[PDB]
Design a protein around this motif. Structure first.
Motif, PDB file in Angstrom:
ATOM      1  N   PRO A 173      -2.025  -0.228  -5.756  1.00 52.36           N
ATOM      2  CA  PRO A 173      -1.071  -0.965  -4.937  1.00 52.36           C
ATOM      3  C   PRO A 173       0.289  -0.979  -5.620  1.00 52.36           C
ATOM      4  O   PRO A 173       0.367  -0.893  -6.846  1.00 52.36           O
TER       5      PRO A 173
ATOM      6  N   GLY B 109      -5.880  -2.941  -2.879  1.00 49.18           N
ATOM      7  CA  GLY B 109      -4.792  -2.341  -2.113  1.00 49.18           C
ATOM      8  C   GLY B 109      -4.550  -0.882  -2.449  1.00 49.18           C
ATOM      9  O   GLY B 109      -3.735  -0.217  -1.808  1.00 49.18           O
TER      10      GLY B 109
ATOM     11  N   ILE C 208       0.846  -1.192   0.000  1.00 55.12           N
ATOM     12  CA  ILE C 208       0.000   0.000   0.000  1.00 55.12           C
ATOM     13  C   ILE C 208       0.881   1.242   0.000  1.00 55.12           C
ATOM     14  O   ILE C 208       1.848   1.315   0.751  1.00 55.12           O
TER      15      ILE C 208
END
Ligand code: HEM
Ligand SMILES: *[C@@H]1O[C@H](CO)[C@@H](O[C@@H]2O[C@H](CO)[C@@H](O[C@@H]3O[C@H](CO)[C@@H](O)[C@H](O)[C@@H]3O)[C@H](O)[C@H]2NC(C)=O)[C@H](O)[C@H]1NC(C)=O
Ligand SMILES: *[C@@H]1O[C@H](CO)[C@@H](O)[C@H](O)[C@H]1NC(C)=O
Ligand SMILES: *[C@@H]1O[C@H](CO)[C@@H](O)[C@H](O)[C@H]1NC(C)=O
Ligand SMILES: C[As](C)(=O)[O-]
Length: 446
Positions: free
Chosen positions: A436, A208, A7
């Motif tokens: 992500p 994410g 993240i």
């Protein structure tokens, strides 16, 4: 739980640096851009993990996010599940009762394909990293616009341009954060796309990530300060005290960060500085009617408009857990010079300063966009109050460039209206998706 290795740091913990640059780019040559995205950018994107460890702070923290048109330029045609993101912020301006006439021209369109967030303790380090990026990417990338931002100097570090301590309140993510007293507790999927209890289907490579709502919000500081002096309530206190009181009534906090709900009549700097106390309230008070009592905090105060707490039901004792799905993570940072002598003297802004506003959320329709349109701009929010007309948020409330009617601000008469010129001027922004980290050298480079 969350994979904090994957993240991007700014989403959950912020960049932890004195200086930031928001570098808005277009993609000219997707093939070449992708090569360098994978080789040169991806490996140096700062994770939540990395930024959470004091011993692994990068010299320059880098994050990156893409607009809808940026994803399309990369041939990524997948449905991210967010129509507001797809349409872009310029199209959303009507929702906020603002005109694009005040916008940065580059924002007023969908030409921007992304933003690189650079963060470092000096501007030199940022500048050098920009040079390195531009030399690496060459003409595969074009810089369209940038905004330099910085933590304010000295004892004003962590305060925004009006002088108020910022960054006290954030949602705690269940299973991730250990909550502070009074703090809201929410599912990860409120902030992180594809995370726990995000009901919206995402592309797998987007699990994410988070939607980044960027806003360049100019603040008219001398004008704000003059308004406070000129409209300070009568009282036995000094003029400065009564002006300060009105300011704090507008924000919902004193400049120290002390919540006015817990200290209605004067600042309490010990309280403001104490993270164990300074958010520990619901707006309820023993012996007072939640529906009509504005003696502790006006219904129209900025923080009350943006997190209503007990105003939307639930526990009257902390923590109140109402409206979790309408939480945002805030990573804003001030921009522009400190107020100058001439401006302070004249009460008239000439040098643009304000807040580089950054909100993260998994659904734009539930986060920033919702707070701005459905709460801040809504004269009857919160609902069920007496009088029913709360008026607009005096900090961010918008009414198509007209003065805002704001009620409840004067302790002596909750029915007393103020008509308040805008002190925050939107120069627009864009909706991005911070993917992500795996997606950066993964799907987005393919
Ligand atoms: C330049 C414009 C703005 C200024 C000067 C400003 C200022 C502040 C200040 C001083 C606080 C209190 C610090 C804290 O509790 O952490 C605050 C809190 C907050 N602001 Fe803003 N703000 C601005 C724009 C926005 C916008 C556009 C939104 C969203 C639409 C927003 C949402 C919030 C939220 C959600 C909180 C925390 C509320 C809570 O959890 O109790 N703000 N703001
Ligand atoms: C966050 O705020 C809450 C209040 O909203 C604080 O809880 C309160 O703490 C006070 C002082 O410790 C408690 O006082 C006690 O009152 C009871 C009455 O039942 C009395 O019997 C005791 O002798 C004592 O005076 C109060 O009960 C308590 N209220 C609630 C609803 O829990 C809490 O301390 C604050 N948290 C932090 C970290 O400051
Ligand atoms: C700025 O506003 C203050 C308060 O209204 C006033 O006293 C002062 O004269 C103003 N400055 C100028 C140059 O008019
Ligand atoms: C309170 O404000 C309302 C609305 O302006 C006004 O009609 C009323 O007279 C005020 N009451 C007092 C005591 O000033
Ligand atoms: C939060 As109270 C002590 O005013 O009921």
């Amino acid at each position: 739980s969350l994979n904090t290795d994957d993240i991007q740091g700014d989403i959950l913990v912020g960049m932890h640096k004195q200086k930031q640059l928001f570098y808005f780019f277009a993609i000219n040559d997707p093939a070449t851009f992708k090569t360098h995205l994978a080789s040169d950018i991806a490996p140096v994107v700062a994770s939540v993990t990395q930024l959470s460890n004091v011993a692994t702070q990068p010299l320059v923290a880098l994050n990156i996010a893409f607009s809808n048109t940026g994803l399309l330029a990369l041939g990524v045609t997948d449905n991210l599940g967010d129509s507001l993101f797809a349409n872009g912020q310029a199209k959303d301006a009507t929702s906020f009762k603002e005109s694009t006439s005040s916008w940065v021209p580059q924002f007023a369109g969908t030409g921007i394909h992304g933003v690189i967030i650079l963060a470092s303790d000096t501007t030199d380090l940022i500048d050098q990293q920009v040079a390195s990026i531009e030399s690496t990417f060459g003409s595969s990338i074009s810089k369209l616009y940038s905004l330099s931002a910085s933590i304010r100097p000295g004892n004003e570090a962590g305060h925004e341009m009006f002088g108020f301590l910022d960054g006290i309140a954030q949602p705690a993510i269940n299973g991730f954060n250990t909550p502070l007293p009074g703090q809201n507790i929410v599912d990860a999927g409120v902030i992180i796309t594809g995370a726990t209890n995000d009901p919206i289907t995402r592309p797998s490579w987007a699990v994410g990530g988070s939607f980044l709502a960027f806003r360049q919000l100019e603040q008219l500081v001398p004008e704000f300060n003059k308004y406070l002096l000129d409209n300070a309530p009568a009282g036995s206190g000094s003029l400065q005290a009564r002006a300060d009181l009105l300011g704090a009534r507008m924000v919902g906090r004193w400049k120290s960060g002390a919540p006015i709900d817990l200290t209605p009549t004067a600042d309490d700097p010990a309280l403001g500085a104490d993270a164990q106390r300074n958010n520990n309230f619901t707006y309820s008070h023993a012996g007072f009617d939640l529906g009509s009592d504005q003696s502790h905090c006006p219904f129209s105060a900025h923080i009350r408009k943006t997190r209503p707490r007990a105003d939307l039901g639930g526990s009257l004792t902390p923590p109140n857990l109402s409206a979790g799905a309408n939480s945002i993570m805030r990573s804003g940072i001030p921009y522009g010079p400190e107020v100058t002598s001439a401006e302070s003297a004249s009460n008239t802004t000439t040098q643009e300063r304000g807040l580089a506003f950054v909100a993260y959320q998994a659904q734009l329709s539930q986060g920033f966009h919702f707070l701005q349109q459905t709460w801040a701009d809504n004269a009857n929010f919160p609902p069920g109050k007496t009088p029913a007309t709360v008026g607009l948020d005096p900090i961010i409330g918008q009414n198509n460039g007209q003065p805002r009617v704001v009620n409840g601000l004067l302790p002596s008469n909750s029915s007393a209206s103020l008509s308040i010129p805008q002190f925050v001027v939107s120069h627009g922004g864009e909706y991005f998706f911070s993917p992500p980290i795996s997606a950066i050298g993964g799907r987005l480079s393919a």
